[PDB]
Design a protein around this nucleic acid. Sequence first.
RNA 1: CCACUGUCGUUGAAAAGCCAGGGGAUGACUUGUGGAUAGGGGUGAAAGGCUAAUCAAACUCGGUGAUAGCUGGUUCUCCC
Length: 48
Amino acid sequence: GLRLNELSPGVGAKKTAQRRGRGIGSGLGKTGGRGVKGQKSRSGSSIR
RNA sequence: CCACUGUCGUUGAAAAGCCAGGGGAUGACUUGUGGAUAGGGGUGAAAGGCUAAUCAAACUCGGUGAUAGCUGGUUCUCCC
Ligand SMILES: [Mg+2]
């Protein structure tokens, strides 16, 4: 009933997603939270 | 036709040659043209040799984005 220009989802409704490997300042650069080179840091790795 | 020795050359004149020497040179000889044998198959006076500069299993395409506990890389910012 407002404008299309001024509706908001409200606080807590939306969270921005994490993007791994986008620099130092993001807290997820380089390894992207995977730590260092073991089986878990590799691509198709799982928790069997 | 071959390839024993050496020098040279080794981003070569050349992805195997040159030069100087060397061996066979009527023979199990060399060579032209066409054909046959096809990949775990061929062919081999046998070196795992050769099968188009590719051979302890050719090449191309496809399964296929094979798999890779391995290596590398992984991109804006500030606060706790
Ligand atoms: Mg060859």
